[PDB]
Design a protein around this ligand. Structure first.
Ligand SMILES: *[C@@H]1O[C@H](CO)[C@@H](O[C@@H]2O[C@H](CO)[C@@H](O[C@@H]3O[C@H](CO[C@H]4O[C@H](CO)[C@@H](O)[C@H](O)[C@@H]4O)[C@@H](O)[C@H](O[C@H]4O[C@H](CO)[C@@H](O)[C@H](O)[C@@H]4O)[C@@H]3O)[C@H](O)[C@H]2NC(C)=O)[C@H](O)[C@H]1NC(C)=O
Ligand SMILES: *[C@@H]1O[C@H](CO)[C@@H](O[C@@H]2O[C@H](CO)[C@@H](O)[C@H](O)[C@H]2NC(C)=O)[C@H](O)[C@H]1NC(C)=O
Ligand SMILES: C[C@H](NC(=O)c1ccc(C(=N)N)cc1)C(=O)N1CCC(OCC(=O)O)CC1
Ligand SMILES: *[C@@H]1O[C@H](CO)[C@@H](O)[C@H](O)[C@H]1NC(C)=O
Ligand SMILES: [Ca+2]
Ligand SMILES: [Ca+2]
Ligand SMILES: [Ca+2]
Ligand SMILES: [Ca+2]
Ligand SMILES: [Mn+2]
Ligand SMILES: [Mn+2]
Ligand SMILES: [Mn+2]
Lengths: 466, 214, 454, 216
């Protein structure tokens, strides 16, 4: 019977398919005058439409790359697969939708980088002594979770410039502890000490040679150090296919962007590397502290998981910063850093306990919806993020892509990627809006009003310029 | 400590004069010096601080100057109220130290004193004491010497002197000299004399008397 | 709305002097309007940065300005068995400038100071210092209320209470209509921040050259606090004055403290005795709520209103993401004696890292409609990041939520166009108040003349 | 205005102790240094020491260590000078000083507090008539006030009647007791014609003796 495919009264095969995803078109010559060419495909065959003359594309989705999820992240030059499938082909007709699935696994035995960024102001003198064996001790504990561990070390105090720095008498510049009975290092902003290496005794021996300095004001310049440790990826030594843990320990507040004006510093942070061959941050006295947004941008761009390992007196402060820098973890540090080993192991578990999907380069005319399967085969509609996972766990998301109308461009590709993961799902979309009988039209057909029109798909269309 | 040698000790001047006090320090003080004024029988008023800066409320006829270790306070066209004492004080180092002082006095015509000697009273003698009093009144300049002679021989033990400030009316000075002996010792001698030695006479003014005699 | 963006006037200073870091209008004794410009990295005599001040006569062509000369020589006084020292190298003279009557106040917030006594010292610290000039007469004065002669050991024994060694007095500044200079000192009291006030007349009459440590009697400073909410709060980063208590015989102070209470930020309204009348808490940590404060009646009821900039406010966006863009808050003053309430309006930036709200300038009534207007700076805003100044017009209910006019920076990248602003003065005497915009990164100042409404 | 009201004059015995006060009128004594200066006619002015009433820190001339102790109470806006183990050399006028602008200057001074150390008891004077000897146009009389304590006294002629042509001299200390003299001069016709009397009042012991001058 009459339906929207016939009721609307279409003029061409293109107009037909765009009425509803259920409409089809008949391009056969021998079709009655009163009979419609834009009807349900079943009804057209009933009217003796030549099957080869039927234009009726179907929305589909076929996988292209479908590597199996790896069981171990160990070995390989990162030929590891944690997302499956890795690439699919999606084909949609106007105002239609098709569903597909993706699997994500928190792979077992994945490589790990841990860069230890340490407050070495005078408040932390007792903390240095309790981590002289951290490198080996931490290597013993992380060995149960990864067979590829690399660790490194960096240190910060504050901007070596008045008023943060004591500048009198001249000897106080060589020894800020001058007016006490002891000696400390001259002030330094941020110094890189040890590039990420799997030789953990290099960590212990580098630490045993470190000592503290002393500055005037309680907030310190660790955010300068977080920025440099993030964007100087060649000097710190982050690996392309490893979890990046940036451990930040302090017992004090921190300076933030726009604090530098108390030192005469107004130039905004440029988010660029400024640690050269001398391994010190050369823009410390000329460039302002970085802002939370700029830190977030670089941390996300380099896949750095920042860990605030701070003492009980400032845990609330850094927990509140953590809420403004998504993906950050906080742990409570003892006044001597005696618990920093277990703190790092718990943060690594909390870091790999979540799988959150992200969508890049989605066309405007495409809309997505997600059903999550976390824990035990339990569907959670409208969800694209699992929590409470363990290493080795696997989740999956069911995805449905709805297209609005038909866009001008007929081929696009977007990406589904879990936050912080290397692998991803690439969806290659194709908008099947045209009929194959259009690729064989007749411009200026004698059949069409003395050549005034074009003949395609069995009908006459008014030619260009009318 | 830093010694502040202030000169002169005193000076006799007149209304309208332009005078200058000086102050020498035992070392450089970098203008860290003040100038003070003490009107007779009253407290102090600040005049200058940091060598040259006038204290609020001070007339402009006052001014300070100097450098290193030599400084000067100058009063252009003296006023009647400007006759008082002036001190310098350094504060380049602790302890703060002062100058000796400078007294500005009224200049006037020289005047010989009016000497007067007074034997002991009957009342005092009946108590066991004996005091001869010698007044030296209304003279100028202020510098004068009194000498007591008992039987022509000088006496120095037991004398008690007192001077008056420059008188308000005539701007003269006056002096009191009192010799006090026991009654028993006062009667061992007969002649009692006070000798006044002023610049107004090469010969000392002499007034005297003899016990019992009158 | 009606600022002319086609025919601008440009004044310029030496390269690298940061000409345009601060600016203000200045009227001489005869009412002629000039522009006083601070340049805090101008070279001194020893070919070292000390800062400088320029007094630009009004000319439609702009050009170069003569300097307002101050003493750039370091000073030493040996007094009281102590040695007093001033250090003007990198002091930043002209990091703030303000004009009142025929007097200009230009401050060097990072001027350093030390006192020596045998082997001990006070420590060489940035107390700050302000320089005062009466240009027509040549009179000069200084004001440095945080200089002390206490030795370092005493502060240690007394646990660093009442420690004014790091004041940076003159970081911000403002003068009341009655002629009381109020200096912001964000480093006072071991980085809690303090205010210092003293009448301009008493500053001139109690100043003599070469004393270095002197009392000005009418002076009035704020107070140290044991409350940790004020620690490292930089109370005095910005400063302003206005009428907020209903008593017209009293002037109220507005103080910005952009790191108050663990970087939450705050703005406090005080009386002239520094007693707190209200407190506006920041909305978001590290947003630098209080970086700039502005006082103007925008809704035409005669009661001063308050504007607070938070140039690092991060706006919430899709997929749980934040975007630092800056935000400006408007507080309308209620009728009679009542607390300032919630904000009447939130203005939020659009360009990432644009720092909308870094500066807020009252314009007076730009379009002459009966309501006062404001200009807000986004010194790194605009689609190119070169900088933007957005005008918002007053209305009966406060401010319009959308700007009436946007001024794109005429300078190259990095000029920080809009980092300083000043409006509400008619420099060309055409009956319309005009706007001057500093671009210290380009060492220039741009003048926007207001024209009749089209 | 700036004023420094010091405490009243003190009278004490050697070995005792006295505490002088200096009250700030019109300002906060916490504003500046407060110094103490000792004045004597022969020795002149001497600097004792200073206090910073804001924090209570003091400085002293080593000459006055143990002798002087300087304190201050910001509450009552008052500063104090304590003198202990008093002796005759401590007999002096004491001033509190403060600067006007310069931190280290000495510009504003109190009126001064007189101190006098003495073991003497309250002693009444001995008024003696001073008549001349047994000639010119002028004539001069006198009056002697001896052995009283403490200061001061008032001396008039004919109970204030005769006032002009008179010289009353400053009192002088004679072995823990004071002595004063006063002359008076008239014409030869006036005396012994007119009865002249020496009126001496000593309020401490509350005595008003009057002696008429008789010739010899
Ligand atoms: C890190 O971030 C947290 C989260 O915001 C901050 O914790 C908040 O701190 C603010 C201010 O200290 C608190 O605001 C106060 O709320 C009180 C009532 O809250 C109770 O009820 C809530 C709701 O159930 C509970 O979650 C909470 O635990 C409380 O039990 C009011 O009493 C306060 O009002 C008084 O003070 C304000 C000024 O702040 C005045 O204007 C009022 O008139 C009144 O006098 C106040 O509003 C808030 O409760 C806290 N939230 C939580 C969850 O703890 C941390 O301060 C912050 N820390 C750091 C270091 O940055
Ligand atoms: C996600 O789950 C929802 C159900 O919670 C699915 O919606 C249902 O889809 C079926 C088709 O099999 C319809 O018959 C129901 O009417 C739908 N229920 C609704 C919309 O409440 C949805 O299709 C799922 N999507 C994906 C991508 O898995
Ligand atoms: C002495 C200082 N004092 C204040 O911070 C201080 C003073 C006064 C007030 C107030 N005005 N109430 C507040 C706070 C202080 O405690 N530290 C200084 C720097 C130190 O770190 C050393 C390093 O890491 O090198 C942490 C602690
Ligand atoms: C789409 O959904 C249907 C029904 O839920 C399911 O059978 C089919 O496998 C899904 N397609 C993909 C590619 O997952
Ligand atoms: Ca008021
Ligand atoms: Ca209003
Ligand atoms: Ca308007
Ligand atoms: Ca104009
Ligand atoms: Mn520290
Ligand atoms: Mn420690
Ligand atoms: Mn610090």
């Amino acid at each position: 019977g009459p339906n929207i495919c016939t009721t609307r009264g279409v003029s061409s095969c293109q107009q037909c398919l765009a009425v509803s995803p259920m409409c089809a078109w008949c391009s056969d010559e021998a079709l009655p005058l009163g009979s419609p060419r834009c009807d349900l495909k079943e009804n057209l065959l009933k009217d003796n439409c030549a099957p080869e003359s039927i234009e009726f594309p179907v929305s589909e989705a076929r996988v292209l790359e479908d590597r199996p999820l790896s069981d171990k992240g160990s070995g390989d030059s990162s030929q590891v697969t944690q997302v499956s499938p890795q690439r699919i082909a999606l084909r949609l007709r106007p105002d239609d939708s098709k569903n597909f699935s993706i699997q994500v696994r928190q792979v077992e035995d994945y490589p790990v980088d841990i860069y230890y960024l340490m407050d070495l102001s005078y408040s932390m003198k007792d903390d240095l002594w309790s981590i002289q064996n951290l490198g080996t001790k931490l290597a013993t504990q992380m060995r149960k979770l990864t067979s590829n561990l690399r660790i490194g070390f960096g240190a910060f105090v504050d901007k070596p410039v008045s008023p943060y720095m004591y500048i009198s008498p001249p000897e106080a510049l060589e020894n800020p502890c001058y007016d006490m009975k002891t000696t400390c290092l001259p002030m330094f902003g941020y110094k890189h000490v040890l590039t990420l290496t799997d030789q953990v005794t290099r960590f212990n021996e580098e630490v045993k040679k470190q000592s503290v300095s002393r500055n005037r004001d309680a907030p310190e310049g660790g955010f300068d150090a977080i920025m440099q440790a993030t964007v100087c990826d060649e000097k710190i030594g982050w690996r392309n296919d490893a979890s990046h843990l940036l451990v930040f320990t302090t017992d004090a507040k921190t300076h933030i962007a726009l604090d530098g004006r108390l030192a005469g510093i107004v130039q905004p942070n440029d988010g660029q590397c400024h640690v050269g061959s001398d391994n010190h941050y050369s823009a410390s006295t000329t460039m302002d502290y970085p802002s939370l947004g700029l830190m977030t941008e670089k941390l996300s761009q380099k896949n750095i998981n920042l860990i605030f390992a701070v003492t009980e007196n400032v845990v609330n402060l850094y927990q509140n910063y953590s809420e403004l820098i998504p993906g950050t973890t906080v742990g409570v540090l003892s006044m001597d850093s005696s618990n920093v080993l277990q703190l790092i192991v718990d943060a690594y578990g909390k870091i790999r306990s979540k799988v959150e999907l992200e969508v890049r380069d989605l066309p405007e005319e495409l809309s997505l919806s997600f059903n999550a399967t976390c824990l035990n085969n339990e569907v959670i509609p409208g969800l694209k993020s699992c929590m409470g996972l363990k290493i080795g766990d696997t989740v999956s998301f069911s995805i449905e892509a709805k297209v609005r109308g038909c866009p001008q461009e007929k081929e696009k590709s977007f990406t589904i990627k879990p936050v912080g993961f290397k692998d991803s799902l690439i969806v290659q979309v194709t908008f099947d809006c045209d009929c194959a009988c259009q690729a064989q039209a007749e411009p200026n057909s004698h059949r069409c009003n003395n050549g005034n029109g074009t003949f395609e798909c069995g009908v006459c269309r008014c030619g260009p310029g009318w | 400590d830093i010694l502040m040698t202030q000169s002169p000790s005193s000076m006799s001047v007149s209304l309208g004069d332009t005078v200058s006090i000086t102050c020498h320090a035992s070392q450089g003080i970098s203008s860290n010096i003040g100038w003070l004024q003490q009107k007779p029988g009253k407290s102090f008023m600040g005049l200058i601080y940091y060598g040259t800066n006038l204290v609020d409320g001070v007339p402009s006829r006052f001014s300070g100057s100097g450098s290193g270790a030599d400084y000067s306070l100058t009063i252009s066209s003296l006023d009647s109220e400007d006759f008082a004492d002036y001190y310098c004080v350094q504060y380049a180092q602790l302890p703060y130290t002062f100058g000796g002082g400078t007294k500005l006095e009224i200049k006037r015509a020289d005047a010989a004193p009016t000497v007067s000697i007074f034997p002991p009273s009957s009342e005092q003698l009946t108590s066991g004491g004996a005091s001869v009093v010698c007044f030296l009144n209304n003279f100028y300049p202020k510098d004068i010497n009194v000498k007591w002679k008992i039987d022509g021989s000088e006496r120095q033990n037991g004398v008690l002197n007192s001077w008056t400030d420059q008188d308000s009316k005539d701007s003269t000075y006056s002096m009191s000299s009192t010799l006090t002996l026991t009654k028993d010792e006062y009667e061992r001698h007969n002649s009692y004399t006070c000798e006044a030695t002023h610049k107004t006479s090469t010969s000392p003014i002499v007034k005297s008397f003899n016990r019992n005699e009158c | 709305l009606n600022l002319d963006p086609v025919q601008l006037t440009f004044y310029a200073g030496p390269n690298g002097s940061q000409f345009g870091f601060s600016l203000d209008f200045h009227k001489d004794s005869h009412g002629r309007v000039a522009i006083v410009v601070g340049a805090p990295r101008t070279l001194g005599p020893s070919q070292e940065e000390t800062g400088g001040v320029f007094l630009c006569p009004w000319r439609a062509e702009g050009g170069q300005c003569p300097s307002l000369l101050f003493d750039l020589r370091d000073e030493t006084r040996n007094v009281g068995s102590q040695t007093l020292q001033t250090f003007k190298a990198r002091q930043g003279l002209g990091a703030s400038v303000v004009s009142w009557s025929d007097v200009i106040v230009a401050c060097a917030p990072w001027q350093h100071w030390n006192v020596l006594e045998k082997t001990e010292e006070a420590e060489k610290t940035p107390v700050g210092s302000c320089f005062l000039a009466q240009p027509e007469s040549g009179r000069r004065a200084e004001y440095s209320p945080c200089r002390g002669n206490t030795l370092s050991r005493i502060y240690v024994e007394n646990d660093f209470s009442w420690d004014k060694r790091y004041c940076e007095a003159g970081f911000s500044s403002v003068v009341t209509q009655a002629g009381e200079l109020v200096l912001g000192a964000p480093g006072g009291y071991y980085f809690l921040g303090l205010l210092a006030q003293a009448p301009v007349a008493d500053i001139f009459s109690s100043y003599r050259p070469g004393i270095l440590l002197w009392h000005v009697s009418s002076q009035s400073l704020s107070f140290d606090s044991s409350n940790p909410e004020y620690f490292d709060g930089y109370w005095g980063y910005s400063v302003a004055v206005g009428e907020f208590d209903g008593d017209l015989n009293t002037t109220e102070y507005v103080v910005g403290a952009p790191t108050w209470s663990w970087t939450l930020g705050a703005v406090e309204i005080l009386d002239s005795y520094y007693q707190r009348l209200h407190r506006l808490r920041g909305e978001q940590m590290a947003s630098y709520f209080g970086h700039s404060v502005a006082v103007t009646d925008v809704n035409g009821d005669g009661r001063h209103d308050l504007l607070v900039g938070a140039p690092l406010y991060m706006e919430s966006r899709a997929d749980r993401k934040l975007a630092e863009v800056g935000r400006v808050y408007l507080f309308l003053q209620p009728r009679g004696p009542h607390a300032l309430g919630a904000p009447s309006l939130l203005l939020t930036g659009t360009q990432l890292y644009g720092r909308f709200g870094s500066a807020i300038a009252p314009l007076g009534d730009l379009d002459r409609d009966g309501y006062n207007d404001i200009a807000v700076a986004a010194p790194y805003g605009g689609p190119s990041g070169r900088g933007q100044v957005l005008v918002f017009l007053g209305q009966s209910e406060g401010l319009r939520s959308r700007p009436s006019q946007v001024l794109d920076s005429p300078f190259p990248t990095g000029s920080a166009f809009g980092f300083s602003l000043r409006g509400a003065v008619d420099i060309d005497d055409n009956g319309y108040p005009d706007l001057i915009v500093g671009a210290y990164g380009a060492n220039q100042v741009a003048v926007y003349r207001a024209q009749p409404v089209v | 205005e700036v004023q420094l009201q010091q405490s009243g004059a003190e009278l004490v015995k050697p070995g005792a102790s006295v505490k002088l006060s200096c009250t700030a009128s019109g300002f906060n004594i916490k504003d500046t240094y407060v110094h103490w200066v000792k004045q004597r006619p022969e020795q002149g002015l001497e600097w004792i020491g200073r206090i910073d009433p804001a924090n209570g820190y003091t400085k002293y001339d080593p000459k006055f260590q143990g002798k002087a102790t300087i304190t201050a109470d910001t509450s009552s806006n008052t500063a104090y000078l304590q003198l202990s183990s008093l002796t005759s050399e401590d007999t002096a006028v004491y001033y509190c000083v403060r600067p006007l602008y310069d931190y280290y200057a000495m510009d504003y001074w109190g009126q001064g507090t007189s101190v006098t150390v003495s073991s003497a008891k309250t002693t009444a004077p001995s008024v003696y008539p001073l008549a001349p000897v047994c000639t010119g146009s002028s004539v001069t009389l006198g009056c002697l006030v001896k052995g009283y304590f403490p200061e001061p006294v008032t001396l008039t002629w004919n109970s204030g009647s005769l006032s002009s042509g008179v010289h009353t001299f400053p009192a002088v200390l004679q072995s823990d007791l004071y002595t004063l003299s006063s002359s008076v001069t008239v014409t030869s016709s006036t005396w012994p014609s007119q009865s002249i009397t020496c009126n001496v009042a000593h309020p401490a012991s509350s005595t008003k003796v009057d002696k008429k001058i008789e010739p010899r």
